[PDB]
């Protein structure tokens, strides 16, 4: 029993990450196969970090502009393009370490895990979710730029982000592996505000699950309710809506736990009515929402990789 | 800016892991060079749980009763010691994969990286601290015994967590990889039960450094207190003592915040007599005290956001 923030093991992505130079600017890429993946920023100055002209700073780069180093290895670069806003390099050799992987695009409220690399080199590994307002609330510091997410089925690594970003409000942007942003931002040193986030009602509802399983009950009630008087509630409370499609999704630990998904919903609602009466969940003092009902399901039947 | 629970990569571990069988019995073990370490109960049978006499139930075997497997490789045990409460069976092959590492004893309050496994395979990875009361809070089920805890500072693995039992309360209690206990436990199904655990006062300190350290001071106050003041008000609140030692290990993060270690203890017993007041300190509700100040300085900024 227990239930902790779990990210996956990331031995098969530690021996992908790799570091990049162009100029004086150093970054962290993902080598896999015979291409180093990396932000498209790595090829500016800060002049031009506020109105980038990506395509004409590019076609002023050449393959000797990039330094490619594994561990204490050179890789040769020799081509380079750009897809959306990640930069693509070409080196001489395949990465002889590369997993089984394909790279997806992640929806919030899904979760992944960060492992957060400098100067080519893994430092740590923590849990993220894809906030409803496309940021995550990651660790990152100068130099973590092309830092990457994933998550793990079986053998293969299905990559889903890459680190470009810092808001103001401290909290993360970035991109999916083909370059394409994760929310309405830019890579450019512009004030850009993360809008007002919500909290994922279908995880929070997952981690009640997580929490009868271990033993925390209290929360349970006689009443139930429908999802149109539910999502009123929810609304009420700047949770996201709740679907037909999420009830669906709870099956399993709905079928674990022998507790019905409106069951649950009505003791979330009085939660949220009530607060919880300086009790705790899980260790909890508030209704955590970075946890999917598959990373309930996965942590409390110990799935392996 | 950020901070979360922040774990080591865990690859260095992964490839140490594999699954050993004896009997019945499966579990995880840890091949370094050619020794393969596990718990020692693998030996055990359904009648030995209660009081096993561990050294005549090992006298019985034979290296071929011991099954090792490295992923999909039968690895030929050719010997077995047993040390204290961990079993080292010694293999014909070294382990190519084998890091850097050391086994350290860790004390209470530090913290470490958990690998948990099943059957040789990883299935996570995650944070803990070694509670004032020798217990951890791990997510663990059966299958999960042998599964290690480690630290990599500086590109060398620093084993110091075997996994072997899970109490009454539904929290963990293992060995040192010499096979000692952390804490009163032992190997057996007797009725345990851990002490009456408290709070980690440093860590709960560098915690709030840590805040400052990312731009958040609303929690501090006018006040400073003396040490003992302090810890008389602290332990109405079951949080440890807090010793000079400590004060000494929070005095870099001190230095980077410019606020003195007792001006930050007067902050934090009012925040045990006030509570948080429908605010949060870097995402929690709650005061968190599995953050050590090592871990804040190796996971935080050297600037502070003032
Ligand atoms: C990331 O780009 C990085 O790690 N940079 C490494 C070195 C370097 C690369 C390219 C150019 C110069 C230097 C960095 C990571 C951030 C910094 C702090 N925490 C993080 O996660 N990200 C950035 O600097 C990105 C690149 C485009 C602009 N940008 C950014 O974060 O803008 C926010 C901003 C800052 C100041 C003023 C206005 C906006
Ligand atoms: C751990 O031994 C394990 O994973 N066993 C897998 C298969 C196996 C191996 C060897 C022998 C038998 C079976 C197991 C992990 C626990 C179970 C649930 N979560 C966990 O972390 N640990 C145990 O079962 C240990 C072994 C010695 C006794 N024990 C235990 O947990 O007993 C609990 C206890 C009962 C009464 C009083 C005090 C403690
Ligand atoms: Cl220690
Ligand atoms: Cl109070
Ligand atoms: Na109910």
New binding site residues.
Partial sequence: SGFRKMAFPSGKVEGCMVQVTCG?????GLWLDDVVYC?R??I???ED?LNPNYEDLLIRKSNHNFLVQAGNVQLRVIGHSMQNCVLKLKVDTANPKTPKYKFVRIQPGQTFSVLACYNGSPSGVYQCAMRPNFTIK?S???????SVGFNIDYDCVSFCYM??????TGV?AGTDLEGNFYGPFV??????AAGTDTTITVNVLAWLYAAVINGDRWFLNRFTTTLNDFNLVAMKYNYEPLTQDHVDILGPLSAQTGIAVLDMCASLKELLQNGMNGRTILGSALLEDEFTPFDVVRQCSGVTF
């Fill in positions: 004086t600017t150093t970054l962290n932000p920023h790595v500016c100055t800060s970090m990651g990152f510091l100068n130099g973590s730029c092309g680190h470009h970003m810092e808001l103001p993360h890579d450019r040193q512009t004030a850009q």
